């Protein structure tokens, strides 16, 4: 209906991040190698310090957002359902799982 296998989901996420990235590129347009040693086969690839910092910031930011949204579902989740008796939080959470099982 319904669930999605772990592949299709992976693809969808890939596309989503592609769009986000392309938006960084457009907004950046609006505001405006391979060396392998002979001694060892160790490969080295020249890097732009920019876009690496931007990458780290992107990952951290998205992690923050996910953590926060899940946290809001934490908050509402416990405050919404007051019907049945409960001894502790963990009980109420379990019985909401029983609401998911219906």
């Amino acid at each position: 209906r319904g669930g999605i296998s772990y592949d299709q989901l992976a693809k969808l996420s890939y596309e989503k991040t592609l769009r986000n990235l392309a938006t960084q590129t457009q907004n950046s347009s609006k505001q405006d190698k391979v060396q392998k040693d002979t001694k060892t086969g160790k490969i080295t690839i020249a890097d732009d310090d920019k876009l690496v910092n931007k990458l780290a910031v992107s990952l951290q930011s998205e992690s923050k957002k996910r953590y926060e949204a899940r946290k809001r579902q934490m908050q509402n989740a416990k405050t919404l359902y007051g019907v049945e008796s409960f001894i502790n939080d963990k009980n109420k959470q379990f019985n909401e799982k029983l609401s998911r099982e219906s």
């Binding site: 209906r1 319904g2 669930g3 999605i4 296998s5």
Partner: protein, 48 residues
Amino acid sequence: HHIEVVSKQMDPLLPRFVGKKARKVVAPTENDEVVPVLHMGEADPNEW
């Protein structure tokens, strides 16, 4: 300098293997290479 190796007879009363003492060890796993693990639901969960 070559060498010559010769065993020494232990005093039968004294412990032979003076250093053997039961002790426990955690071994490392030295991983040289990776073995690729190469294999060839949606509505299913509603069943399962």
